[PDB]
Design a protein around this nucleic acid. Structure first.
Ligand SMILES: [Zn+2]
Ligand SMILES: [Zn+2]
Lengths: 40, 128, 116, 179, 209, 96, 144, 119, 167
DNA sequence: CCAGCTCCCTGCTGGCTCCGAGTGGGTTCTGCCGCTCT
RNA sequence: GAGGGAACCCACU
DNA sequence: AGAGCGGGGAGCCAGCAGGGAGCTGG
């Protein structure tokens, strides 16, 4: 993951940017899907 | 060097590092001397052949490896061994280069005229 | 396989694919002049999306004369048995996924290029 | 065939053919030199109303102003065509990934204008200005009069004060165009 | 596929009825926690065949304090929604004297249909919902704190306590997803309860603008 | 060695390639300082002008110049930040 | 297959407690559970949330605008606080919570995302003199 | 920072030269002009650029570069500040005589030996 | 010093040559052609008008510009109707003053030993390489530019072009 | 039956405004050379 | 007991 | 004759063309 931090991310935060440099999600899984790697 | 070498290989690798050390081969046949002479350059072959003349008629095929590396567009004509062809073309190319140098120096500096600024010493009153 | 440009002869322009339904076959026709020609290969256009696995055919033998290239004597030439060979990685944009080494024989008049 | 011979040097290379196919397809509707010169002159700085004026303007752009280094004289168009085809070939090589892109920060792609070239640029502009003012003065004294004195025609203030101004201020150009 | 569309319909119905319970409508505990198997048993298995039909999926609920205050949830079969479907739905609302409805669309509504909704909003309140929006309950997300719609007496007591005007409160848009969830109109105030790093609990108030 | 690993110490002294690569590395830090100053200063100016009139009022609420409520209590607890300290909750972590 | 806006998905099993599933056991301790979590290179948060076996509670984006359009203004206030805290505390630096909370409350007080820019600040109900003090002085005074 | 630079001590910026001697030498050192060749010969030959002008092609680029280096090293037809680059992989020889090229003197090494001797 | 010497010896004359001759018609035709430049050593003319060899310390102290007069040879041909061409040879016509780089070829300190420089109140360790403009020492900072006549292919980002070749 | 024509969504292109704070010191240029008229 | 501005360049933290 | 004076990027916004429902009309 190449997530941007520091001053460019602060600029992307306080300026509400419709085009962030590295947009991303953190997807969490429910149940057994989170426990084994194959169904993940 | 994680390598084992027998006496042939030891002598020819040492001699393959210092070809330049050879003045006179003594009485070694070319078939023994075949490796160190193939990793070599034509001026050193001329040195070896003009100190060790008896090798000359043996080394001619070797010169082919040089000729197709230095005169790759060429082929021998008949009654032309590769050594004499390489020396004839080598000296012809050096003479062509020397004639071109003596042309494009004479016909570019002495023959034509180029224009540049000359010193005035006028001290003109045109700017008073 | 790839398809190349087939050229007209009357005006030396480009031939475009077309069909005839009377003969019901494929022909390359010139549409600057009125030239037509029956097409040899049925393949009109081909993608090569994952057909970049080869890089040996773009290598030339002249890189044996490059003094900045690494030389090895542990990879003898298969075609002529010369002990020395230059090796280098691929210089393409397809080389981001591979640090694969290619070898070129440094003996003149041979120019044999291989891989590993 | 001639255009692709100027662009693609090995005709046994199919991917270069594949990438030059769209340009050939786009420019098929023009098939003559004069029609292409008309198409060029239609997009000029000021498109002339006369088609022959557009032909002259397009020829002047393609000869005098298109790649002056390979050739600017008349009938030097094959060298210009080989150079333009080499540019297109380099573009296709970069497109294939067969050649690496050039680096702006690579310092062999840079030249250093020292005092020589910079002063030459200045003196070229100011000698053009001096010839312009000499032309105006002599035009005035051949229009109403008959003769002009050449020593009074030349304004030495142009070259002198322009070099002095550009070296004194550092603004490399003209005094009225310092911004 | 019939199975994934049945799962979609069950999730939409569960989120709708969680919304109706959150809006104060009387929705019994039996039909909040309706499992996928119970939804399959009551409605069907093959929506493309038509055992669960979207027209049969219409939900009628009544509000807790006022049993005559009822609201519909309609499920159009067509992916878009035009003026004709709106006219049919509001005719059903008129003949069943009901002034509130939710419309769960698949793809969207036409701009003319949204214009019809905002034109008839003085008489009948009709809410647009995408099925994509309703596939989860956004109020159960960890980022979304607790929203409570305030009564008018609570709003007047709030403004009397803090000596405020309505425009001095923080704002929430009427098109906000939680605002659309709770079905709140302009002028209402939402009390937001959230945890606090410093105080433990913090209550914000947001006027609908 | 080719790609910029300096195997020497500052006491030992750098090889010429290591010296040039170290200069390449330090130029990055100089550039980062010089080009980050302006963007950071613009960020500070924009942050100040967005919040300069936000203040704690006498009813202990936090309001801007329009007298709109930003926070009902400052920091949601009404406390100044120059007297709060790091402490530990004793009943959060241990088991029942 | 998949969702159009998401180019790449990076699976990983986190070894740190920052992105784990903390649970309270039957004995009553906080136990960290290592569970597989995904990252994306694009943002299509609503479709991901709607997907099967994806946690519709803890799944979040780093995109402020889509969090605002999907979950609302208080959720984007909390997301803004979390992302600002991440930027600040990447270095181990600590800023007191009230300053971050005040910045996020300023940016989310009027129901939408008010950017810290002239297009956020100079469109409020503040006076013309404050707006011309910030930026676009002549334009603001002509509008006034 | 980075925009204003300084010269190294032995760096010398080239002053410029006329391409005419190099062009004449290339014309009668077996380089064929662009005007007199069919394009089919360009595929296997080496393009020759003089100040960025494609002037012809050569069939034997290695001995041509050896000859050009020999001419420059003895201060013949080619003057010392002329740069000659053989792009071996791309089959190009670029000769630059123009001003503004920054260069530096280097000792010449032939067969792992300096040509600088004790004499 | 090398760039200034190349500019003075070669570039000024080449610029004068590449300038086209002036053809002027009302009618009488006048063709003006600038032929050969002449550059003197840096001389000063006072209000009296007597030339003097102007020294660099004199230029620095008196706030003079250390410049040399640039003369040129001009030919004016007259083309009338029913008349032959008429030649006027205006030899060594003053057209301005070129500021001179210190210790260059056309500077007055050129070729002088250290003793001669000390007798002229000049520092022999002083490198030259600068001009004296109104008594102020001015150095020309070298300017980087992209190389000419070379094909450079880049990839323009966030544009309609995937790749672009530039010359 | 079915062709006809008007008014809100999206998208592209152009304008438009922003780009750290505070200090020293310097040089140059403003403010120009043809006049028409006595 | 205090009569220019502007532009540019260098430098400082 | 000679003194004095007129003549680079990066990211917002709105304004246009293209679409695509949908009422009135035959
Ligand atoms: Zn044809
Ligand atoms: Zn081999």
């Amino acid at each position: 993951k190449n997530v941007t931090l520091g001053v460019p991310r602060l600029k992307e935060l306080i300026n509400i940017s419709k085009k962030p440099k590295t947009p991303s999600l953190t997807v969490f899984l429910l149940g057994q899907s989170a426990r084994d790697a194959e169904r993940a | 060097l994680p390598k084992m070498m027998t006496l042939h290989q030891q002598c020819i690798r040492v001699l393959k590092n210092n070809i330049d050390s050879i003045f006179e081969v003594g009485g070694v046949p070319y078939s023994v001397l075949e490796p160190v002479l193939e990793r070599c350059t034509p001026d050193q072959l001329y040195r070896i052949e003009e100190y060790n003349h008896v090798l000359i008629e043996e080394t001619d095929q070797l010169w082919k490896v040089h000729c197709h590396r230095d005169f790759k567009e060429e082929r021998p004509e008949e009654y032309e061994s590769w050594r004499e062809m390489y020396l004839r073309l080598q000296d012809a190319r050096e003479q062509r280069l020397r004639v071109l140098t003596k042309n494009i120096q004479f016909a570019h500096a002495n023959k034509p005229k180029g224009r540049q600024a000359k010193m005035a010493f006028v001290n003109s009153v045109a700017k008073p | 396989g790839f398809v190349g440009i087939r050229f007209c002869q009357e005006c030396n322009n480009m031939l475009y694919p077309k069909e005839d339904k009377e003969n019901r076959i494929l022909l390359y026709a010139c549409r600057n002049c009125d030239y037509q020609q029956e097409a040899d290969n049925s393949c009109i256009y081909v993608n090569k999306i994952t057909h970049e696995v080869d890089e040996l055919t773009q290598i030339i033998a002249d890189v044996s004369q490059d003094p900045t290239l690494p030389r090895t004597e542990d990879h003898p030439c298969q075609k002529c048995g010369h002990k020395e060979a230059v090796f280098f990685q691929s210089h393409s944009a397809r080389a981001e996924d591979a640090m694969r080494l290619y070898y070129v024989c440094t003996a003149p008049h041979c120019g044999h290029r291989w891989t590993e | 065939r001639d255009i692709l011979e100027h662009i693609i040097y090995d005709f046994e290379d199919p991917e270069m053919m594949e990438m030059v196919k769209p340009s050939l397809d786009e420019a098929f509707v023009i098939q003559e030199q004069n029609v292409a010169l008309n198409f060029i002159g239609s997009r000029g700085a000021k498109p002339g109303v006369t088609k022959e004026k557009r032909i002259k303007y397009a020829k002047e752009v393609l000869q005098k102003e298109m790649l002056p280094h390979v050739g600017v004289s008349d009938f030097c168009e094959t060298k210009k065509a080989y150079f333009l085809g080499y540019m297109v070939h380099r573009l296709l090589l970069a497109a294939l990934g067969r050649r690496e892109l050039d680096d702006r920060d690579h310092y062999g792609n840079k030249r250093l204008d020292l005092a020589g070239p910079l002063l030459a640029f200045l003196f070229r502009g100011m000698f053009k200005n001096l010839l312009k003012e000499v032309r105006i003065y002599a035009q005035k004294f051949i229009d109403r009069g008959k003769d002009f004195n050449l020593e009074l025609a030349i304004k030495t203030r142009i070259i002198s004060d322009g070099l002095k101004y550009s070296l004194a201020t550092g603004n490399w150009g003209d005094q009225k165009k310092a911004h | 596929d019939d199975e994934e569309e049945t799962y979609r319909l069950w999730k939409i119905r569960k989120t709708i009825m969680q919304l109706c319970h959150d809006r104060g409508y009387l929705v019994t505990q039996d039909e909040l926690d309706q499992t996928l198997e119970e939804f399959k048993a009551q409605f069907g298995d093959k929506p493309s065949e038509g055992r669960p039909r979207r027209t049969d999926l219409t939900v009628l609920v009544a509000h807790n304090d006022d049993p005559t205050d009822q609201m519909f949830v309609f499920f159009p079969e067509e992916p878009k929604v035009g003026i004709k479907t709106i006219k049919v739905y509001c005719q059903r609302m008129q003949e069943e004297n009901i002034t509130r409805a939710l419309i769960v669309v698949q793809q969207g509504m036409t701009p003319s249909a949204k214009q019809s909704l905002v034109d008839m909003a003085p008489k009948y309140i009709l809410e647009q919902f995408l099925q994509q929006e309703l596939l989860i309950n956004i109020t159960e997300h960890e980022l979304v704190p607790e929203h409570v719609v305030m009564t008018k007496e609570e709003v007047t007591e709030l403004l009397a306590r803090y000596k405020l005007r309505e425009n001095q409160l923080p704002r929430i848009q009427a098109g906000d997803p939680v605002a659309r969830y709770f079905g709140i109109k302009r002028g209402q105030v939402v009390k937001i309860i959230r945890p606090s790093e410093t105080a433990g609990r913090y209550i914000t108030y947001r006027l609908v603008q | 060695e080719s790609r910029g690993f300096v195997e020497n110490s500052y006491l030992a002294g750098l090889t010429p390639t290591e010296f040039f690569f170290h200069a390449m590395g330090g130029r990055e830090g100089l550039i980062d300082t010089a080009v980050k100053t302006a963007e950071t200063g613009y960020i500070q100016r924009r942050l100040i002008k967005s919040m300069e009139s936000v203040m704690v009022k006498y009813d202990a609420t936090v309001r801007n110049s329009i007298n709109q409520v930003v926070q009902l209590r400052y920091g949601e607890d009404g406390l100044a930040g120059e007297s709060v300290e790091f402490q530990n909750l004793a009943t959060l972590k241990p088991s029942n | 297959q998949g969702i159009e806006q998401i180019s790449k998905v990076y699976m990983h099993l986190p070894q740190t407690d920052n992105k784990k599933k903390i649970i309270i056991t039957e004995d009553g301790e906080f136990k960290a559970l290592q569970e597989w979590i995904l990252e994306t290179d694009g943002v299509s948060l609503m479709r991901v949330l709607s997907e099967k076996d994806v946690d519709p509670v803890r799944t979040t984006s780093n995109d402020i605008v889509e969090i605002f359009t999907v979950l609302g203004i208080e959720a984007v206030r909390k997301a803004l606080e979390r992302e600002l805290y991440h930027v600040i505390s990447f270095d181990g630096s600590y800023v007191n919570y009230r300053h971050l909370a005040l910045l996020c409350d300023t940016m989310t007080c009027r129901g939408h995302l008010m950017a810290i820019t002239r297009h956020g600040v100079n469109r409020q109900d503040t006076g013309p003199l404050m707006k011309c003090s910030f930026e676009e002085t002549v334009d603001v005074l002509m509008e006034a | 920072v980075g925009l204003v630079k300084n010269l190294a001590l032995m760096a010398y910026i080239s002053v410029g030269s006329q391409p005419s001697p190099i062009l004449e030498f290339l014309e009668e050192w077996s380089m064929e002009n662009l005007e007199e060749i069919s394009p089919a010969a360009i595929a296997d030959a080496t393009k020759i650029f003089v100040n960025g002008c494609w002037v012809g092609i050569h069939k034997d680029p290695e001995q041509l570069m050896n000859t050009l280096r020999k001419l420059r090293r003895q201060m013949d037809i080619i003057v010392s500040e002329v740069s000659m680059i053989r792009d071996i992989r791309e089959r190009e020889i670029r000769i630059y005589t123009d001003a503004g090229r920054i260069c530096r003197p280097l000792l010449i090494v032939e067969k792992q030996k300096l040509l600088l001797k004790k004499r | 010093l090398d760039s200034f010497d190349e500019f003075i010896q070669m570039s000024v004359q080449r610029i004068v040559e590449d300038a086209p001759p002036i053809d002027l018609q009302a009618p009488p035709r006048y063709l003006l052609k600038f032929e050969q430049i002449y550059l003197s050593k840096p001389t000063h003319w006072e209000r009296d008008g007597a030339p003097s060899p102007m020294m660099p310390n004199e230029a620095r102290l008196r706030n003079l510009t250390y410049s040399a007069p640039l003369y040129v040879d001009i030919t004016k041909t007259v083309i009338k109707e029913g008349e032959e061409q008429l030649q006027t040879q205006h030899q060594k016509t003053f057209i301005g003053k070129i500021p001179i780089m210190l210790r260059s070829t056309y500077c007055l300190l050129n070729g002088l030993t250290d003793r001669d420089l000390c007798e002229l109140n000049e520092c022999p360790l002083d490198p030259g390489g600068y001009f004296i403009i109104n008594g102020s020492e001015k150095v020309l900072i070298a300017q980087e530019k992209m190389a000419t006549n070379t094909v450079y292919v880049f990839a323009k980002k966030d544009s309609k072009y995937a790749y672009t070749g530039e010359c």
